[PDB]
């Protein structure tokens, strides 16, 4: 999968995921209204006043399992795999603020209102695991985004300067990785000679060359990375929803191009996204790449029931 | 730009492309039904009940100029752009079919039904390149295919190549020569998962899926695209329904779509996937859906009087 | 195997091959001296005073069949194996000059003394073939170069502005390859930035990322036209000898790196070179990288007789 | 720069390095026989019987600086430009050995064996970078390696890493972490000939030899000569003789030269191979050739008094 995130001209956020896999968990946009009572499972704390959230999440027993939601304020948080590097503690931990990994999307987005109190927080969390989640996660509002990978070393809080999150292996890798192509530019190629030849391009793309077009992690890691960085800024809601889907697109898994162990095609099932300037969650699926809408102001947030619309 | 073509188990058609550029022409989706008459420039000869087709484009002296078209046949035909290869001569041959480059769509639209009765026209077929009084020449080479197999059209300086395309795909420059040899670079990736092996004493395996596909350039220059959606449109499981093979027509163009930002123009601009339409013969109906909106609309033959006169164009 | 040639200062001559395959042919430095009487297969003409000319050959019967030679004038040329692509009629022509393919380089080399005079006497010339060698040439003096192949459609005589060849496929499709690397460059890379991300090279290099490092032939050439074309330019016999070789050395092939179809490995057998500057022939093998030198005034050149040196 | 270890059937050392860099510092084959008494700088401790080594550097105040070297005993040593990675303490530790970086090369070759002589002392050493008079600090990570086997030696501002080096190879910047983590990419590429196979229609071959290894970077960067090199070391297949093994050592360091012209510098210069060194165990003798020159040159152990008792430098 991919996490994307921008900003307009305003601040506002825009945050998007994609969700590489090969059945379906049941996903559903998943509303956690603020009169809603949560229940944490090792006693963590929280804001006297909830915000009102809003993702995809499936409904486990009786709580959201968000698999990338965002609040009111502008907040937003996927969950990404990382197997073979993520490594947590299965036993809770006297004096910090213990958070289950399920409930850890829930958690951020239920409480805090930007990336900073983020940040700040996460020294003193313990993220316990209760086959398990093995996940990192990419955290953004309006201003800046953050990774926060658990491995057997510790808590890694790198701050993401390209907005973008892929998974394995550790997101010092990505970035010492992206040095190799800082070359690769979008300007229409220069006519240059080597010795009595002249070399021309036959149109535009031929400075982008040397970007990988495979699916693999590390490869979509810098295509994504490259996208995001070089799509001019927009000015109003729909072109950005147009950028978060078309950036995302960009690293799409298309049936075919690559197994699983399983033997199943790894597939973009959908493509979630949210912007704060109009508090709104956005979702397609492979099967349809119309954009469905759904907006906070049309859900009873002072109600105290998760709404599962399908 | 990058044009589609495969099919289902029945053998039905199903044909798209992207349409990259920095600006619009005012296309649209242009109905050129079948009691419509056009006086071809050059008296080329056609069939005598003519096709209903359907298509993109836009009109001009009241002759329908389309960028990609399909008939009530399973036959589609797509112009994509080739300067400083394509090569036309400007008066008609006489004792040949004198076609002249913007009617070329249209022309074998309307009068054939299957790739094998076209191919055997262009033996005696001489595109005529008439520049239109406001407009550039348009120097393109054609993507035609059916249900069963597709062929490329290049006429360069040095006369016509008409070329058997396996791969069912066709791009930008160069000569559809150079895509076929380019191809074999890429010979060796892969969509199985990764094999574990080892480097002497280093084991390597894969973090997950797509390391066996590694080496598959991704940039949206013109052969890159080609060896991108070649691998995409070949490795793609085949279809049975017709919701699940449009779903793949529009998401193996998608795989070499062109984001804005990506690449600039000679002129300074973007290049953008402006639009992606599609045809499928199962049903008779045009699809297509733009930068600014992924919804995929339908266009249907049978939604339109396809014994009227006119042209009918819906925006 | 490559094909490399350029020029100092004062227009001498350099031009040089690598050799690439399993087993050694017996290859030997091989004299060829202008008093020696040959006599054509299909009765081709030549000059009346032959140009002494000086390569690596073997003696099959009793004519010269070089691999690859130069003349005391300046010209060389090389061959290199063009299958799937060669095609040669088995026939005499009447009306032209017809010469057998094995005699090809023996023959250019004794009667012209510029490129010029090759690409002029070509357009009346049929090469016959009498496993067949099915090769093409790559031909240069002190000026340019020229590459000669012979396919099913007829011969093809391109201007080689790059001053490199290589195996299959057609030449047509090497220099249209080489447009995809136009931006490919040998400046330190220039620190950019990724959105916030601020990328620089570890070192130098990063600016040459995107050009091949496998041994195929299409990659060969790419990466030997850079080396050639990015070469600085040399004033004395001394460092343009190394920069032959060192350029032919950038696409050697070491034993491991890709099998044939026997089962073997390709390996650069041996490295010969030319400087008309000198007169003298260079050559060293794979197990032993030292430079031997054997000039053209250490051999009578009026003799009559082939001098085969080991 | 570029570091390459292997060995033959019977268990010897075959150990070389390559020196790229646009300018000398006035290197040259260095003699430390073991009658040469080394006050070392922080009092680290050394053999009874030190060992006689041998290699290429510079002498300053009567002390050997080691590019590279390696003992009586097959064990060699090499230092990599590693800057804006490597970080060292400028004082010493009491309490464990303090060894200098500079004499960090001269240190393990005098006073060891193997390797897992030497790994298991890391584990109570600190380097120490004391800066020369007249020089720059130098920031480099080491290659050690024996006839069994090899190790990476990167000091970093968070501590000491001592990583085992299954591939044999070591080149500059970035960690040895990332080099690893980048074999995984070209985990498919093979020198086996391409098999023939076929992209729905199309059918692939390869025109030669190298298709299979398509994929393999060729540029002259840090990461891009590691994966290069390492394929390099691990498909050469073993050999037996002595003269075949010192022709494997440097036509696995060609595979990475840098030739005039391909990169420049931080400051305007290219950067080329300037020398190439190599040692081997099974005689106990030193290899080098330069840019200038391809003859591989040898100095061997015996030819020298290794009884002496000051440093012998020879042109
Ligand atoms: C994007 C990527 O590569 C990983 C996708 C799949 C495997 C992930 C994405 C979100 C995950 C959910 C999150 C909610 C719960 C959390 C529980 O701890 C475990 C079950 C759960 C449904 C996760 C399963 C894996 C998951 C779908
Ligand atoms: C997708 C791609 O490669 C870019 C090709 C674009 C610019 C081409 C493709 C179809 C072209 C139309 C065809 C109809 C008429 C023909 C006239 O001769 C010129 C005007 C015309 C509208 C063409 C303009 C360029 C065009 C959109
Ligand atoms: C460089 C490359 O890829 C091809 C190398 C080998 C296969 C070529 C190079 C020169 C060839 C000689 C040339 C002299 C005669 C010519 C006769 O027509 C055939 C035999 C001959 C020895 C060639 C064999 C192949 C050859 C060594
Ligand atoms: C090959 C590569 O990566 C480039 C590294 C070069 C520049 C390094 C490698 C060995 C270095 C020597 C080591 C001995 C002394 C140590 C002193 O602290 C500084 C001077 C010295 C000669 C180093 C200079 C840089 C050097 C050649």
Request: charged fraction near 20%; charge should be negative; include cysteine.
């Amino acid at each position: 999968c991919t996490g994307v995130r921008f900003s307009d001209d305003e601040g506002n956020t825009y945050f998007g995921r994609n969700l590489d896999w090969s059945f379906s968990y049941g996903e559903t946009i998943l509303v956690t209204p603020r009169g809603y009572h949560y229940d944490t499972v090792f006693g963590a704390g929280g804001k006297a006043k909830p915000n009102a959230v809003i993702g995809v999440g499936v409904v486990m027993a009786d709580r959201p399992m968000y698999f990338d939601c965002a609040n009111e304020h502008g907040l937003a948080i996927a969950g990404l795999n990382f197997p073979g590097y993520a490594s947590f503690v299965h036993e809770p931990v006297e004096g910090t603020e213990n958070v289950a990994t399920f409930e850890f999307p829930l958690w951020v987005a239920r409480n805090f209102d930007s990336v900073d109190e983020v940040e700040e927080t996460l020294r003193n969390v313990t993220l316990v695991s209760q086959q398990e989640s093995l996940l990192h996660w990419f955290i953004g509002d309006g201003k800046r985004s953050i990774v926060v990978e658990q491995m057997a070393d510790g808590m890694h809080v790198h701050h993401d300067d390209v907005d973008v999150l892929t998974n394995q292996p550790t997101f010092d890798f990505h970035m010492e990785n992206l040095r190799n192509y800082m070359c690769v530019s979008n300007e229409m190629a220069e006519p240059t000679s080597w010795g009595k030849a002249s070399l021309t391009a036959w149109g535009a793309g031929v400075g982008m060359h040397g970007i990988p077009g495979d699916v693999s992690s590390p490869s979509r890691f810098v295509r994504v990375a490259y996208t995001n960085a070089h799509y001019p800024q927009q000015n109003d809601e729909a072109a950005n929803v147009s950028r978060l889907f078309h950036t995302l697109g960009s690293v799409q898994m298309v049936d075919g191009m690559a197994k699983m162990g399983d033997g199943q095609f790894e597939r973009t099932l959908f493509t979630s996204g949210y912007s704060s300037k109009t508090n709104t969650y956005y979702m397609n699926t492979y099967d349809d790449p119309a954009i469905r809408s759904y907006a906070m102001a049309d859900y009873d947030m002072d109600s105290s029931e998760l709404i599962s619309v399908a």
